[PDB]
């Protein structure tokens, strides 16, 4: 993994994230939503679990993005939890949780769940 | 379970659901959101898995409610997945998914996730 993870990944919606997997489990990078302007880049940080393991299992990892930068503040944060599978067709399959900050009455509807698959292509 | 499940349950938000657990896994009832008016009752249907099992495990079950009745159409449906634990303090602990019907562009944000615990009291 690690080496394999470092790089640019694209998801089916048109978002791109560039990440560096450091030697001791760290994931650091930026996530850009669209257009191709600075205004869409957000910091991301996460961790990955290096095993990794002798039977081709994927590498579990997760990262977070708080949707605040110098151009936008969306009062929310998303976490992606998934695994990295390398090889010819390497991908990161994830499920994500997007929570928005609410008042206590609306707290019951503050989190959206979804999924994303990221590829190098 | 079954016998134990049949009855009225209340959740921490003030919603009530009355359900009948039939001999062969069926769950049928109504869910009422608030006020205490017919306008807040919706049909619910689900299934429960009778085991049940010799080591005190809970009874898995799930049900669905489409938020449409003769007074309201919220173009959405919620499914609750959880387990029933009986006894002195019987409860049904669940995690739920609420999906609203969207256009294909907004499909990524069509499902909210939450949790609910229902008691007989």
């Amino acid at each position: 993994a690690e080496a394999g993870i470092t790089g640019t990944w694209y998801n089916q919606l048109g978002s791109t994230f560039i990440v560096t997997a450091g030697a001791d489990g760290a994931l650091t990078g930026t996530y850009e939503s669209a257009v191709g302007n600075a205004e869409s880049r957000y910091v991301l940080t996460g961790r990955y679990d290096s095993a990794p393991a002798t039977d081709g299992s994927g590498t579990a990892l997760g990262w977070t993005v708080a949707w605040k930068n110098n151009y936008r503040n969306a009062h929310s944060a998303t976490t992606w939890s998934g695994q990295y599978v390398g090889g010819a067709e390497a991908r990161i399959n994830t499920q994500w949780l997007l929570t928005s900050g609410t008042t206590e009455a609306n707290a019951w509807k503050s989190t959206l769940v979804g999924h994303d698959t990221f590829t190098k292509v | 379970a079954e016998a134990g499940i049949t009855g009225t349950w209340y959740n921490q938000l003030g919603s009530t659901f009355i359900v009948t657990a039939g001999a062969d896994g069926a769950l049928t009832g109504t869910y009422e959101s608030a006020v205490g008016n017919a306008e807040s009752r919706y049909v619910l249907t689900g299934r429960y898995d009778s085991a049940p099992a010799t080591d005190g495990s809970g009874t898995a079950l799930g049900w669905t409610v489409a938020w449409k009745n003769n007074y309201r159409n919220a173009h959405s449906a919620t499914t609750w997945s959880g387990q029933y634990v009986g006894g002195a303090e019987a409860r049904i602990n669940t995690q739920w998914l609420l999906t609203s019907g969207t256009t294909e562009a907004n499909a990524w944000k069509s499902t909210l996730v939450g949790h609910d615990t229902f008691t007989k009291v």
Binding site: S15, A34, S40, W67, S76 | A105
Partner: peptide, 8 residues
């Protein structure tokens, strides 16, 4: 137009 969707 939440930053996690397209575009924005």
């Amino acid at each position: 137009c939440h930053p996690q969707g397209p575009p924005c």
